[PDB]
Amino acid sequence: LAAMKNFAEQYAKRTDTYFCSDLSVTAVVIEGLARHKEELGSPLCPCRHYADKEAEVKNTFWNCPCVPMRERKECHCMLFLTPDNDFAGDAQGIPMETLEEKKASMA
Amino acid sequence: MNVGDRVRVTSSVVVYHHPEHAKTAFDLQGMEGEVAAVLTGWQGRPISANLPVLVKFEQRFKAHFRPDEVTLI
Numbered sequence A: 001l002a003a004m005k006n007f008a009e010q011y012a013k014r015t016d017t018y019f020c021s022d023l024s025v026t027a028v029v030i031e032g033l034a035r036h037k038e039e040l041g042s043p044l045c046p047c048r049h050y051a052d053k054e055a056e057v058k059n060t061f062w063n064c065p066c067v068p069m070r071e072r073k074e075c076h077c078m079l080f081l082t083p084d085n086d087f088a089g090d091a092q093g094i095p096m097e098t099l100e101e102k103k104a105s106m107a
Numbered sequence B: 001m002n003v004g005d006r007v008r009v010t011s012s013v014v015v016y017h018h019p020e021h022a023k024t025a026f027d028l029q030g031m032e033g034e035v036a037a038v039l040t041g042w043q044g045r046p047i048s049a050n051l052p053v054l055v056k057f058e059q060r061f062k063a064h065f066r067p068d069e070v071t072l073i
Ligand code: SF4
Pocket: A029, A044, A045, A046, A047, A062, A063, A064, A065, A066, A067, A069, A074, A075, A076, A077, A078, A079, A080
């Protein structure tokens, strides 16, 4: 979870992209990425439905950062947002506490 | 569509991983390449790539497209 947190923050700065104005959204995706990397070994995008999560991982198209994000700076999850995006805040960092709160409230 | 088919990027597609325009927005529109793959599955297991057409261009550069963004040459 901590490694996924650091990854997002660094990638966001590396690509000149920003986190959602509402960090809870960001938190949910990071927690989901962390979760997928544990169960699958890779950061498979958690904001999608797959028929074969294991195959997806082997193909790598959707392993974060996915092909659309690496090539077109397109993140349908709203994890990495371009400056012009309406939902883009000015933050490229997210408190660890925020994530902890998500682990606390899942359901 | 077939692997090996030559295609021209007809739609406007802005990318940031081109070897001569790293981290910089570059439109591939007008460029011509060869289809290297059409992502549908891995070892028979269906995948969901939403940019399934993999096109290889010169300069050791490749990029993914939707079937509708390129035209058979
Ligand atoms: S859409 Fe792509 S870049 Fe965004 S969280 Fe999913 S895998 Fe990562």
